[PDB]
Amino acid sequence: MKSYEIALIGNPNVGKSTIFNALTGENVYIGNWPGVTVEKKEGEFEYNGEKFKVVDLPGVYSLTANSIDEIIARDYIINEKPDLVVNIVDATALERNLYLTLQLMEMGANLLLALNKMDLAKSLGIEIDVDKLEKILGVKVVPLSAAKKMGIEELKKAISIAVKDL
Numbered sequence: 001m002k003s004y005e006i007a008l009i010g011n012p013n014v015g016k017s018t019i020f021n022a023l024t025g026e027n028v029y030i031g032n033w034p035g036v037t038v039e040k041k042e043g044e045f046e047y048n049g050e051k052f053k054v055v056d057l058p059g060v061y062s063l064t065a066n067s068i069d070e071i072i073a074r075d076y077i078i079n080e081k082p083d084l085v086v087n088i089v090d091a092t093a094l095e096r097n098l099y100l101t102l103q104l105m106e107m108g109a110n111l112l113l114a115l116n117k118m119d120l121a122k123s124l125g126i127e128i129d130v131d132k133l134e135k136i137l138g139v140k141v142v143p144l145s146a147a148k149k150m151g152i153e154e155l156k157k158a159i160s161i162a163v164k165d166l
Ligand SMILES: Nc1nc2c(ncn2[C@@H]2O[C@H](COP(=O)(O)OP(=O)(O)O)[C@@H](O)[C@H]2O)c(=O)[nH]1
Pocket: 011, 012, 013, 014, 015, 016, 017, 018, 019, 059, 116, 117, 118, 119, 120, 144, 145, 146, 147, 148
């Protein structure tokens, strides 16, 4: 079976854990990053006949070596070279995620954005222009509400597309 390796990353409290649990099958490996007690979760899912290995990365605001988490996350991306990184973003806190997205691009990460908590933005009267984000960043943006079991299928399809290339 053709297999890819993808990574999830985002700011703390974006629902990354929820999306990780949704994306993956039941068999999740809970280890630690080498040398430290920082938890490392790994799982997988199959989609359209292909296997996607999922690595959860530590939640971070940047990749400028400001903490053990930023150091782990960056070392993984640069050295493991996942086939895709899914940058999970809080629809209600989109601006603060700008530097993370920018630094992912700078280090040359193949990127896809998952825009989570759309329901919460909806209830908070926060409108978000996804097409304008996609155009500006030149990366696909997948709107979802992982806690409402909304858009996980979209996320999986978008992932299977993004690992190829144009
Ligand atoms: N409204 C809303 N809340 C969510 C969604 N996904 C996750 N959450 C909430 O966000 C909080 C943090 O989720 P978590 O998976 O721990 O985010 P993490 O810190 O990045 O791992 C949880 O209490 C979830 O209930 C969503 O799609 N919509």
